Write a protein that binds this ligand. Sequence first.
Ligand SMILES: [Cl-]
Length: 296
Amino acid sequence: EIGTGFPFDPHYVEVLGERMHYVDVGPRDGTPVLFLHGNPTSSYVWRNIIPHVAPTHRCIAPDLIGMGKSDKPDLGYFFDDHVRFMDAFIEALGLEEVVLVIHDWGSALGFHWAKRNPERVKGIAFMEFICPIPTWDEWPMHARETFQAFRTTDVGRKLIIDQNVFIEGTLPYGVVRPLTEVEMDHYREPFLNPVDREPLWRFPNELPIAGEPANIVALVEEYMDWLHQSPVPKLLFWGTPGALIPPAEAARLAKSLPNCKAVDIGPGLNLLQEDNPDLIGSEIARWLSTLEISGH
Ligand SMILES: [Cl-]
């Protein structure tokens, strides 16, 4: 009873001269809800969540540049490249105020956008998000060893670029329930050609771990300090054991962040959307019905 289909018409918009693919469903009668995926997923990750929200709120879910059905410009696919394209995507759709629903690298994009444009963010739903990781000791050995290997230019590229391990390993390892072959083939579609795998390797190399890279550590601290002082409505989803956000950290954030509701999805690792999309979609729709936005 977790759906494998993608029941949305294709949309594409030109952004900095490149095409970006996106979902866009639901009425243009209020504040749209912008869904931002991370590594190594696409808008496909939101397929079972959006249908709970779309009847009453417009849902917009882009594929990041170099990912999903978006174009593949010859870039390094550093976080700042994703910032440029996601800022331009939001402007190309003429979005004014938004609600954010964000995950993994999509959460870095959304929180960084919110810090720069705080008056335009009416709420943030977030899960398995990017915050500073001051020590490798915070991760279990198996995850520590694999990401330390990923964060090399020789070994890391052989694994992610040549062997496609982020798709063939990290992805199904991040879902507690078994991902099916149909779902794996959806996630594999953008990365059939090894030369298209650059974003999958640059992303782990950008993760703010033990002080490096220092520019990402600084920007992440900046948007976490922003979040910690912001009155914006917040909805945090978490699972057990989690990956980036263990239960103990979710419990801390539930008390430290202003105007925050936390929801336990049950068993989960990084890809919570693949373990309990029904609860995540149901709870986003209930929370949207409490915000001071059109339709309240
Ligand atoms: Cl990553």
